[PDB]
Design a protein around this ligand. Sequence first.
Ligand SMILES: O=C(O)Cc1ccc(O)cc1
Length: 770
Amino acid sequence: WSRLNPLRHTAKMSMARAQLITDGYKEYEGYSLYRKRGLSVRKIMREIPIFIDDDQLLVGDFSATQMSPEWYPDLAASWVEDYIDKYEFTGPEQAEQARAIAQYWHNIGGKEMWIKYMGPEQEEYLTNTVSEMYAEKAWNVPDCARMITTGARGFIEEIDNKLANLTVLTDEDYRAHEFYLALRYELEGVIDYAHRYAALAREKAAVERDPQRKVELEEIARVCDRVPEYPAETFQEALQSFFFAVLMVYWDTRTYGMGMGRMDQFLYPTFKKDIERGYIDEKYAQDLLECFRCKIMEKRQFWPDVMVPSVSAESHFHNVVLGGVDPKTGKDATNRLSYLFLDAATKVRTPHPTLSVRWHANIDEKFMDRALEVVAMGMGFPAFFGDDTTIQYLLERGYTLEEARNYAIGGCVLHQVPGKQSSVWPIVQNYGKMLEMTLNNGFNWYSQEQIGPKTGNFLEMKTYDEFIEAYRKQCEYWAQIAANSNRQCRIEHLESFPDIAMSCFVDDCIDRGKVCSLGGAAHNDNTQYIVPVGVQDLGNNLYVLKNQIFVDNPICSKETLLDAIHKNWEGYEDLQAKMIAMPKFGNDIPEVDELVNWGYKFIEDIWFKIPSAYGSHFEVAPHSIGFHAGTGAKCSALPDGRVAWTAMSDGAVSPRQGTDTNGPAAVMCSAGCVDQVDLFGVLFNMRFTPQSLADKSGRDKLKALIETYFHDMGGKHVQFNVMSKKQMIEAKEHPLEHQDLIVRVAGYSAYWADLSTTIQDELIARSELT
Ligand SMILES: O=C(O)Cc1ccc(O)cc1
């Protein structure tokens, strides 16, 4: 009854893109890839199954059967093998169809073409090589709502004004002449897509008996008759217009961490249009935002199980930034449309649309108090981002102050302006696992193979300054060997799986006539980066290296140490308790909280002088998504009392696990001692108990503590979740029951049933605060 009604995961495998792209490549054979793609995608949207759900007033969906996740063979296809039905993956009996597409799309798929290119193929855990040929790229926020007040028609004109009055093909990239035609070809695709619903919604009208539900869709057909093609005019046809731009991208590439930030900023002129004109009510607007959280869900993920350890089983980042600052004037933009957004998170309790708030000095204290109740209930949501510091990072990249003020976020914590960055290609490297390799000697304990460089013998280091060069020499190897892989993989993805439709919403892409992935990016700045996930464990161990190994303590010699972790404290269980009691990050120890700052300052030195993509340099994104588990489980033992095969850390500057013997103010004062201005978004989450946040103390102690954390300490991002540790243990022993539990992990909340085991038991260990 609570306004909205989401439903169940009674889903099966769907072949409405794979089979529809397969015969698109065959019917449009010979046309260049830029055109053979664009011609096939409009074939999809104009021909794919369509339906309108019940009591919903949004039409376009992310699949051809309710919640059945589509499959894209353009990116990969040879991962569907022998089981016929068996593990969250299921089909009816059509396995002979997947093997038919896999037979066709063999050696012509993204990874399928990619894995030949190399030659030898080094399977890895120190870098996500498996997640770079298999995972779809997005993690941006294009201007599909900042550049959709023009409409698809206004786009096709600029393309037509381009192919005619500026072409003169003097090899002005035949690739560019074909990109232009392609971009039109699926711009009419998003027209046919919404003109199919108009004919179907109008058909769903006469046979309808409820006259209010009849007029509900009779206006939707009138919306979709003008929403995608021409510029929108009303709040009901501005949302549907923006959404169809999110789908046209999804039909060309399963847009991963695509952000849709600032819906409280660009749906306002129509919001302020219909309301003050009595055309739409606040509850009606709260209906669409409710119907927006539901319809966005169907985009489930469908990747091989070999990555579920590192990417969970349903890690979706559909973030939207509510609140903020008016760019042209500097005042606050926190408005009622932001109030209805987190009002929607009440009546519908979906965990994917992140719904993030952006704090700033003169923000609206009322709609920030009301934001603290949204995380006071279930779900660890409105991930408060602090501006002021993030602005300095964007302004020092090159963006103008208006572009910087107007920033949103893409994916987890990546903050960036809308239509400028271009489909990021990330790199994971557990800089605690590097410590394992150099404390060894490039041996990769879990693998027991001399796969690294013999930088130096630990039993012959002599001094700490000698170690940190043997740690630099080892880290730099996995730099020019990891970047060098997905650098020329973004370039290689020009023979397969480029993002043509997404270029409709990247600046200068239309002008230079080149896609955002390869070339026509307006800013090749924050477009490639690294995620160190567990660098707290670097500082905690570096402290043990700096303090209490070299100089004093020869009993805990370099020999007694390496063997203790070799056997994982077995026979040394007395020692680990002392190291686990040594000063650890998360409290308020400058002697231990400053080494994690120098830690990032050690990573920011090597990678920032490494060129990237088409220009600029690699960034450093300390965030995480689930890569602490799949990497830590293969990262064997650490000096700071760690056990062998356990996770790294909970991302960026979050305290390790049970290391905060001090209150919440310390856990942020520590995390504040990080010069996080040049850090591409920090993932900082911590757990409170519901007795603290569900009272005035939540909107009094926290606010005074989170505002102080960002203004005095220069933080960037803070995200909370309230849930008892027993409630998670009670979910571990009853996982058949709590299959719809909202648990935060790392910049998102996902159902506990699709969460990995190593992530569950790790979430038990996170401390409780008051
Ligand atoms: O988000 C990540 O860090 C992993 C990733 C790698 C490649 C890709 O295409 C998508 C995601």
